[PDB]
A paper describes a structure:
[name] is an enzyme from [name] that is specialized in the removal of the 3′-phosphate and other 3′-lesions, which are potential blocks for DNA repair. [name] is a highly active DNA 3′-phosphatase, and although it is from the class II AP family it lacks AP endonuclease activity. [name] folds into two planes of beta sheets sandwiched between two planes of alpha helices. Notably, the amino acids residues of the active site of the [name] 3′-phosphatase are identical to the active sites of NApe, E. coli Exo III and human APEX1.
To determine the reaction mechanism of the [name] 3′-DNA phosphatase, we solved several crystal structures of [name] with a DNA hairpin substrate containing a 3′-phosphate moiety and a product DNA lacking a 3′-phosphate group. The use of the DNA hairpin structure enabled us to capture the interaction of the enzyme with DNA; we used DNA that forms a short duplex with a 5′ overhang and a phosphate residue at the 3′-end. The structure of the pre-incision substrate DNA complex was solved for wild-type [name] in the absence of metal ions to prevent cleavage. Contacts between the DNA and [name] are mainly through phosphate groups on the DNA backbone, and not via nucleotides; a vast network of indirect interactions is mediated through hydrogen bonding via water molecules. However, our structures of complexes with substrate and product have very similar organization of the active site, either with or without the metal ion cofactor.
Numbering used by the authors: 0 to 256
Write the structure that this text describes.
DNA sequence: GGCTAGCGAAGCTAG
């Protein structure tokens, strides 16, 4: 049995009490975080270590930031993407926890399709694809998870016509997501729930969460051996409903052996 | 768009 959770916290300094409540009440074996928004030396390691968790993280000031939190020691920690060595943005950290290779990604948002950040998103997803491909030659049990900032299909967007060829929903972004699936990875939540709306992000503006209008952009992609052990995937909307929430909801995948 | 958070002390960027 194994329980893994991904959560974009949108600044861990703000969301730390909710992260700790998440770890005490129904704990996962592994919790990965995105957008820590704090430098390498500002991570709250002591607060999480005192509760019995091992922490590895990659941080920078103000932006980005990724972390892996587990009860067992995370081994062979890799930082970044080898095909993109000069990129200072801290978006990728990978470690092996209990025989499972965990790759935590805070994928590039892109801002808009005509934004220079969209070409950066293009290069970045190309660099990510080569990294996961090389990693998958070594680890039969592998999980690529995090904030992909890509809604895979129209069932993952509350208004597909309004979002036609818009950021997160464009057909080229959906090809990049498909390029990751073509490595042998499974959209774990669509294997459990082939149909229905399972949005993970709700815009802060216009009370979009109360209207239940959002996107599914936080995913858990698993290798064939992990897919055969998959039993459930859920989106935790209770946490999204808390006072002063993150705009993302946590996603938890459960495996058995 | 019409929040939120960071930086820093005011509006900007970024999400």
């Amino acid at each position: 049995a194994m329980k893994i959770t991904t959560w974009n916290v949108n600044s861990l300094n703000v969301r730390l009490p909710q992260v700790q409540n998440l770890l005490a009440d129904n704990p996962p074996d592994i919790l990965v975080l995105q957008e820590l928004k704090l430098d390498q030396d500002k991570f709250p390691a002591a607060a999480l270590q005192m509760m019995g968790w091992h922490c590895v993280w990659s941080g920078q000031k103000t932006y980005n930031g990724v972390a892996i939190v587990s009860r067992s020691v995370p081994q062979d920690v890799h930082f970044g993407l080898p095909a993109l060595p000069d990129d200072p943005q801290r978006r990728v950290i990978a470690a092996t926890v209990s025989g499972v290779r965990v790759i935590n990604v805070y994928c590039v948002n892109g801002e808009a399709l005509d934004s220079p950040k969209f070409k950066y998103k293009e290069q970045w997803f190309a660099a990510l694809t080569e990294f996961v491909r090389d990693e998958m030659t070594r680890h039969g049990k592998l999980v690529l998870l995090g904030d992909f900032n890509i809604a895979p299909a129209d069932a993952d967007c509350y208004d597909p016509e309004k979002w036609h060829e818009k950021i997160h929903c464009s057909s080229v972004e959906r090809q990049w997501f498909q390029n990751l699936l073509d490595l042998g990875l499974t959209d774990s939540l669509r294997q459990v729930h082939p149909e229905g709306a399972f949005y993970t992000w709700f815009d802060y503006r216009g009370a979009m969460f109360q209207r239940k209008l959002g996107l599914r952009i936080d995913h858990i992609l698993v290798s064939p051996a992990m897919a055969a052990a998959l039993k459930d995937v859920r989106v935790d909307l209770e946490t999204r409903a808390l006072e002063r929430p993150s705009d993302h909801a946590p996603v938890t995948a459960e495996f058995d052996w």
